[PDB]
Amino acid sequence: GLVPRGSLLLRRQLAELNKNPVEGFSAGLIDDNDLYRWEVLIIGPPDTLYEGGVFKAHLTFPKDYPLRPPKMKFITEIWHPNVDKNGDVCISILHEPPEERWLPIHTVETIMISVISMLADP
């Protein structure tokens, strides 16, 4: 058994998230065997286009995380300028070159903060 290096980081994040649940989203593994493939459930914010909505996105971490950012893709249909027709999310926190670029220090919380903000202002 060879453990991917970022496993400890990802496990800590998952646990930190589970012990500090947040309003408006839940994050977990699609498959407990696999720390690199997450799903995030996101509640559409009040007084927006998305109010009443609930959305599933996949957050997929590269095997060399945290040096490279995860990729995010909405699975539930959604309309947003930063979300392409495949569902892929185009957001600067997830672009390689503080929250306007990927830095190895960004956590899932940092990413979701940015995603929630972009929905609260389409």
Curated annotation (Swiss-Prot):
One annotated Gene Ontology cellular component of this protein: cytosol
Residue intervals of the UBC core domain: 8-122
GO-annotated molecular function: ATP binding; ubiquitin conjugating enzyme activity; ubiquitin protein ligase binding; ubiquitin-protein transferase activity
EC number from the UniProt entry: 2.3.2.23
Highest taxon listed in the record's lineage: Eukaryota
Residue positions of the active site: 90
Known tissue expression: Widely expressed, mainly in skeletal muscle.
Gene Ontology BP annotations: proteasome-mediated ubiquitin-dependent protein catabolic process; protein K48-linked ubiquitination; protein K63-linked ubiquitination; protein polyubiquitination; ubiquitin-dependent protein catabolic process
Reported modifications of this chain: Autoubiquitinated in vitro.
Annotated catalysed reactions: S-ubiquitinyl-[E1 ubiquitin-activating enzyme]-L-cysteine + [E2 ubiquitin-conjugating enzyme]-L-cysteine = [E1 ubiquitin-activating enzyme]-L-cysteine + S-ubiquitinyl-[E2 ubiquitin-conjugating enzyme]-L-cysteine
Associated pathway: Protein modification; protein ubiquitination
Keyword annotations of the record: Acetylation, ATP-binding, Nucleotide-binding, Transferase, Ubl conjugation, Ubl conjugation pathway
Top EC class of this enzyme: transferase
Family membership noted in the UniProt record: Belongs to the ubiquitin-conjugating enzyme family.
Primary role: Accepts ubiquitin from the E1 complex and catalyzes its covalent attachment to other proteins. In vitro catalyzes 'Lys-48'-, as well as 'Lys-63'-linked polyubiquitination. May be involved in degradation of muscle-specific proteins. Mediates polyubiquitination of CYP3A4.
Protein's recorded name: Ubiquitin-conjugating enzyme E2 G1
